[PDB]
């Protein structure tokens, strides 16, 4: 949903019913060479609908890092690309009736931002980009999702 409701894509999905798509993610990070740190970007399917004892939240650092993800270091990986596959147990996403999400993306902090004991310059700025992959829009309809 986060991508369908962004970039004017809902306008091109309107008047359709079913969708099979892979989500492509890209982070771009910027930090002066005097700042260090590391983050873990992971996705958890059905994390908002599964029992809490099975969520990526409510488990341990080792469990979290056991989820599919990418290490994002500030001075090694200024950019990371992630691919989330079609996550519905169904044959396709329903864009009209079943307003639902099947996978939740998280950005975790392994090591906090490490900078000098200064100020305003000890910081890191990120920007997230998203699009779709392996797409199929098939069945037309007259109905819409008011949630766009």
């Amino acid at each position: 949903s986060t991508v369908l409701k962004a970039g004017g894509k809902a306008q091109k999905l309107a008047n359709f019913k079913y969708l099979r798509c892979d989500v492509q993610v890209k982070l771009v990070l910027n930090a002066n060479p005097f700042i260090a740190g590391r983050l873990y970007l992971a996705y958890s399917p059905y994390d908002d609908k599964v029992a809490p004892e099975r969520r990526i939240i409510y488990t341990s650092r080792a469990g979290v890092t056991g989820y599919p993800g990418v290490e994002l270091d500030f001075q090694l990986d200024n950019s990371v690309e992630m691919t989330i596959p079609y996550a519905s147990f169904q044959e396709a996403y329903d864009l009209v009736s079943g307003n639902e999400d099947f996978v939740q993306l998280y950005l975790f902090t392994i090591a906090p931002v490490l900078g000098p004991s200064a100020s305003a310059n000890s910081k890191v700025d990120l920007s997230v980009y998203m699009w779709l992959d392996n797409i199929s829009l098939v069945i037309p309809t007259y109905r819409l999702n008011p949630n766009l």
């Binding site: 399917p45 059905y46 599964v50 004892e53 488990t59 469990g63 599919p68 090694l76 147990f89």
Partner: protein, 208 residues
Amino acid sequence: INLSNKTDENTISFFDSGDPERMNSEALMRGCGEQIVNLRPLLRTFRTINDNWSLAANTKTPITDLTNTADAEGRDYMSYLSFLYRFYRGGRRYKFFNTTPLKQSQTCYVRSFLIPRNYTADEINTDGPSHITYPVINPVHEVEVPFYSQYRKIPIASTTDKGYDSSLMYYTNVGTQQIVARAGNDDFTFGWMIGTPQLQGITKEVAN
């Protein structure tokens, strides 16, 4: 020296040891007698989820009333391993070993029916295929549930739909106590590999 923070992918092993597979196979030949290389065989094995499951007479009980806890516990392999994955497919097998300590009627019989998952007994008929046993001549009720699904895979989370896969309904003409063991058919398996949850260990009471 050049200013840089990089990764050279340096790898080291600490001993001039022989081939690990040689040593492992010798150790198995000498102290195990078998080799486990996959975790589906453990879903093919039967393991206990309850040593005493009491039933009330003339009552159609869905086994969900039990599995809905036996899955969160983590005692069996179908539950322990489910916490590593997000999907599953295939059918399941259940065995019911009779542990009834009293004679309730001249003829005790056990019966199993199908039922859509998460349904109640007042929501389904008693027709369809069935299996019947007589605990006095056969105290082990073995039954298999196929993968009758509207979906090719089933998640381990809550859904909006209901009745999209089959389950088991259990009936008895008397009050029976049973040991329940379950397993997967020759087609059951799990999907995504995800991270682990935290494990519970020894518990103690301390009168501080």
